[PDB]
Amino acid sequence: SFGRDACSEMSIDGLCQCAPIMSEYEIICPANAENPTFRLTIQPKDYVQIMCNLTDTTDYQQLPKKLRIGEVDRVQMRRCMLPGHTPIASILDYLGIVSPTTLIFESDNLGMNITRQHLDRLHGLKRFRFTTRRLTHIPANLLTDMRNLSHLELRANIEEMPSHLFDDLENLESIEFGSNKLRQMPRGIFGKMPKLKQLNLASNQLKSVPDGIFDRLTSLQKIWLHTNPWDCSCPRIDYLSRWLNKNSQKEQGSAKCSGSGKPVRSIICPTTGENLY
Numbered sequence: 001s002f003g004r005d006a007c008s009e010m011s012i013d014g015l016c017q018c019a020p021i022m023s024e025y026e027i028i029c030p031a032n033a034e035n036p037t038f039r040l041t042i043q044p045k046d047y048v049q050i051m052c053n054l055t056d057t058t059d060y061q062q063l064p065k066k067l068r069i070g071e072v073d074r075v076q077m078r079r080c081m082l083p084g085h086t087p088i089a090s091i092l093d094y095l096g097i098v099s100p101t102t103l104i105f106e107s108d109n110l111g112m113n114i115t116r117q118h119l120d121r122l123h124g125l126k127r128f129r130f131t132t133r134r135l136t137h138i139p140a141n142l143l144t145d146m147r148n149l150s151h152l153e154l155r156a157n158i159e160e161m162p163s164h165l166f167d168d169l170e171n172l173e174s175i176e177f178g179s180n181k182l183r184q185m186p187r188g189i190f191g192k193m194p195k196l197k198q199l200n201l202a203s204n205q206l207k208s209v210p211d212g213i214f215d216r217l218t219s220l221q222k223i224w225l226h227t228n229p230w231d232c233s234c235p236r237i238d239y240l241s242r243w244l245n246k247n248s249q250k251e252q253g254s255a256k257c258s259g260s261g262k263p264v265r266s267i268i269c270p271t272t273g274e275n276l277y
């Protein structure tokens with residue numbers, strides 16, 4: 001495991017400078033650079049922060065060599081590029097990071113779209129957060145085999161969500177899809193969520209939801225649907241207005257009608273005699 005002795009030795013050969021700050025260590029790569037390629041913040045047996053300043057994926061060869069961080073709970077990556085068509089776990093293995101349960105990936109310099117391969121060997125994760133100001137495509141197989149995942153956060157200006165995104169994922173307790181550009185929610189997306197307690201869909205472009213979309217959320221406790229331009233015309237808002245009125249205790253904040261500004265829960269649609277779902 002990385003400690004005092006490893007930090008002192010790193011400052012001797014001067015490939016990367018190391019300085020112990022508080023109960024943590026700061027690694028600058030390359031040494032004495034005004035704008036370093038890598039700035040690592042390591043707290044042994046707790047967390048690792050990787051601050052990147054890369055122009056292209058080949059800059060990863062400038063990472064500290066033979067570094068053995070060991071077991072940590074959280075890995076935070078900031079401004080880092082997706083390592084081409086190579087898993088993110090390969091960066092983690094090279095730095096000697098062992099079995100992290102939380103991965104945070106935040107970057108405006110991705111260099112490419114995220115794939116299923118980028119998450120290979122990260123099946124053990126319990127918490128995953130992907131953040132970017134860049135418009136990104138979410139493939140249908142992105143979260144396949146992420147069976148230990150209980151907390152998912154995607155803030156990547158996503159417009160569409162694939163229908164089979166949560167296929168075979170059953171341990172999910174929290175889904176944070178707020179502050180994206182979502183115009184639609186596909187029917188059957190929350191069909192197999194027996195443990196889901198929190199769902200955030202606030203600050204998107206949702207005008208409607210398919211009928212029966214939340215009916216299988218048996219463990220649901222909190223839901224965010226505000227800051228969406230909801231179409232409160234009848235019968236379009238019939239299902240959501242009735243559902244929000246019945247589950248009023250679960251709603252966090254207030255979903256409002258694009259026109260009037262009235263809460264969605266206050267709409268009572270008349271009966272025309274048509275078929276319901």
Ligand SMILES: *[C@@H]1O[C@H](CO[C@@H]2O[C@@H](C)[C@@H](O)[C@@H](O)[C@@H]2O)[C@@H](O)[C@H](O)[C@H]1NC(C)=O
Binds near residue numbers: 111113
């Ligand atoms: C990111 O993806 C954009 C859209 O990709 C399209 O959709 C996928 C499902 C495939 O069919 C692919 O062949 C299509 O191109 C691209 O337009 C965009 O260039 C990609 N971004 C980068 C940086 O490569």
Ligand SMILES: *[C@@H]1O[C@H](CO)[C@@H](O)[C@H](O)[C@H]1NC(C)=O
Binds near residue numbers: 035053
């Ligand atoms: C990243 O490096 C460039 C020079 O390549 C520099 O202009 C920029 O300020 C650096 N970013 C930070 C956060 O220091």
